[PDB]
Amino acid sequence: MKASRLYTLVLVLQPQRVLLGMKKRGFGAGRWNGFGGKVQEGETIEDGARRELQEESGLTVDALHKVGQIVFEFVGEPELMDVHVFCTDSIQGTPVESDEMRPCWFQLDQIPFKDMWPDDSYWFPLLLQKKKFHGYFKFQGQDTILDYTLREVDTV
Numbered sequence: 001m002k003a004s005r006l007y008t009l010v011l012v013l014q015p016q017r018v019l020l021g022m023k024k025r026g027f028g029a030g031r032w033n034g035f036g037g038k039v040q041e042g043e044t045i046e047d048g049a050r051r052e053l054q055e056e057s058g059l060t061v062d063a064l065h066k067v068g069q070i071v072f073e074f075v076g077e078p079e080l081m082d083v084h085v086f087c088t089d090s091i092q093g094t095p096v097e098s099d100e101m102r103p104c105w106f107q108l109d110q111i112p113f114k115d116m117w118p119d120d121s122y123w124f125p126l127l128l129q130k131k132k133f134h135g136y137f138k139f140q141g142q143d144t145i146l147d148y149t150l151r152e153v154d155t156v
C-alpha cells in the first residue's frame with residue numbers, strides 16, 4: 001500500500017489540433033504535455049485543473065470534462081502520482097507562455113509522441129477517440145516503463 005498525491009492534466013483538444021506545452025523546468029522538463037500540477041487544499045480536482053490551465057497557458061475555461069485517470073509509480077519514490085486527466089474543446093482566448101510552459105498547437109496527424117512522456121503513446125490515442133480510460137505506469141527514471149496497465153472504462 002502506497003499513498004498517492006493528486007495531480008491534474010488538461011488537454012485542449014479541438015477538432016483538428018491539440019494544445020500542448022513544452023515543459024521548461026521541473027518534472028518532465030523537455031517534454032510536450034498537457035497543462036496541470038498539484039491539486040491544492042480546498043479546491044475540487046476540476047477547479048484545480050482549471051486553475052493550472054490558466055496559470056500555465058493563460059487560458060480560462062468555464063468547464064472541463066473528465067476523460068481519464070493515470071497512476072504513476074517511480075522506482076525509489078514511495079508516493080504515487082494520481083493524475084486526473086481532463087479535456088475541453090471550448091476556449092475563448094489565446095495561449096501565452098508562462099515560466100512553466102511554452103504552449104504550441106499541434107495538428108492531430110503530428111502529435112509529438114517522441115517528445116512526450118513514453119506512456120502518452122498508449123493512452124493519448126484513447127483520448128483522441130473520445131474513450132475514457134484508467135491507466136497505471138511504473139517507471140524507472142524518466143524513460144523506462146517496467147510495468148503498466150491500461151483499460152477503457154465507461155466512467156472515470
Ligand SMILES: Nc1nc2c([nH]c(=O)n2[C@H]2C[C@H](O)[C@@H](COP(=O)(O)O)O2)c(=O)[nH]1
Pocket residue numbers: 007008009010026027028033034035036037038072081083117118119120
Ligand atoms: N502526459 C503525461 N503527464 C504526466 C506524466 N507524469 C506526470 O506527472 N504528468 C503530469 C501531471 C502534471 O500535469 C505534471 C506534473 O506536475 P508539475 O506540473 O507540478 O510538475 O505532469 C506522464 O507520464 N505523462
Ligand SMILES: [Mn+2]
Pocket residue numbers: 036037038052055056100
Ligand atoms: Mn503549475
Ligand SMILES: [Mn+2]
Pocket residue numbers: 035036037038052056100
Ligand atoms: Mn505544472
Ligand SMILES: [Mn+2]
Pocket residue numbers: 037038052
Ligand atoms: Mn501548482
